Design an enzyme around this catalytic site. Sequence first.
Site, PDB file in Angstrom:
ATOM      1  CD  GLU A   1      -3.180  -1.140   1.934  1.00  0.00           C
ATOM      2  OE1 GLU A   1      -3.319  -0.209   2.760  1.00  0.00           O
ATOM      3  OE2 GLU A   1      -4.018  -2.079   1.810  1.00  0.00           O
TER       4      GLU A   1
ATOM      5  CD  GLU B   1      -3.812  -6.025   3.670  1.00  0.00           C
ATOM      6  OE1 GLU B   1      -2.582  -5.855   3.517  1.00  0.00           O
ATOM      7  OE2 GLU B   1      -4.548  -5.279   4.332  1.00  0.00           O
TER       8      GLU B   1
END
Length: 390
Positions: free
Chosen positions: A140, A229
């Site tokens: 991320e 994820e």
Amino acid sequence: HMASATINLSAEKQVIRGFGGMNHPVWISDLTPQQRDTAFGNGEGQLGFTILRIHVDENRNNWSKEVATARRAIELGAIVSASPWNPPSNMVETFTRNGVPNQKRLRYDKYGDYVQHLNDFVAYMKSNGVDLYAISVQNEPDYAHEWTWWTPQEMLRFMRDYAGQINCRVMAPESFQYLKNMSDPILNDPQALANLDILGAHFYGTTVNNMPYPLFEQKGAGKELWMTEVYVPNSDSNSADRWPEALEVAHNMHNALVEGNFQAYVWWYIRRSYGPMKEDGTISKRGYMMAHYSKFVRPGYVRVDATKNPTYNVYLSACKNKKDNSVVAVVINKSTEAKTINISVPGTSIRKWERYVTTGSKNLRKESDINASGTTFQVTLEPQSVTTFV
């Protein structure tokens, strides 16, 4: 009256790599020996996961914590990928981002040092019997309030000029929401693209219209596509058995597979009160949703074109085992009413399907066999259910 679906075994889509979740023995408790078996075995009462994700700690003194679970996962048939959240602190600097001070980034003069850190992790894990399938540039990079930010251009420079030196498959960019601005520069640069092995993405807030990726259809030959994820639809404490909320997990997986062409689907923490395994080590409703795919759609099966939404609230995917041309169909019925579908599978020699059904009151219950009339399988789906046909 009756809704119809066609499964086309000759229209091959993505090869399935697998399904799994995260272990993080620094932030939370490691999986125990019993839990490793429940997660990565495919026996009765086991999830059948075939992918373990782990983190690459910024402090190498923590790396040993990963080894026991990763070894066991591999022994049980899984592959392992690793993602970093931060570089070692001596490689990081701060900056102000959109008016917010004290944010972290990798120093521009430390990109080579960061390659060495990643390679050191790969080598350490290899020495301990864990041959990583892939390692990621950054978890991320575009949602790094609490870790290390990378702009699309910083990610591009790394992918283009440094990532070829990584001694493993390279995964990038793991956007929190599969934002294409993070990955487009990689796909559009020939050297960066050559240095990419796996396009990784997370699914937080990703809508179905944002699941296709035309540029990856164009430029992704030989690359894998992993959803590395998510948790859905929330991370509420003690939510994992909520029903019919758990159907959102199956639906999200369906969407990843059919709308996104994803080869892998990886949850966040495997063991958690909102995860596929509860704190007591048993499978939650959300876990059974995963299991409808993971226990049956094994690595190396290939998704095939199939009518994805044959009637309102019904969602269908199908994957083929190329060794014997058998098929696994996963069918979600989110309706409060039962739904009857005629499923045509032209050209199959299969004439009988077994089926396993989860509802609010049963988990992977084996129900009566379906007998084909020629190449058509008529099925009635219980309200608020998932069925896997095999």
